[PDB]
Structures are given as structure tokens and as C-alpha cells.
Amino acid sequence: GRCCHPACGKYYSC
Numbered sequence: 001g002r003c004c005h006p007a008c009g010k011y012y013s014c
Contacts, residue, residue, distance in 0.1 A: 003012035 001008070001011055001013065004014040005012060
């Protein structure tokens with residue numbers, strides 16, 4: 001989604 005650190009798994013945009 002909108003997240004930019006790996007704490008969102010592979011659902012970070014960076």
C-alpha cells in the first residue's frame with residue numbers, strides 16, 4: 001500500500 005519500511009512485509013512501496 002503506502003508504507004516505506006519492511007515492517008509491512010512486502011506491502012511497502014519502497
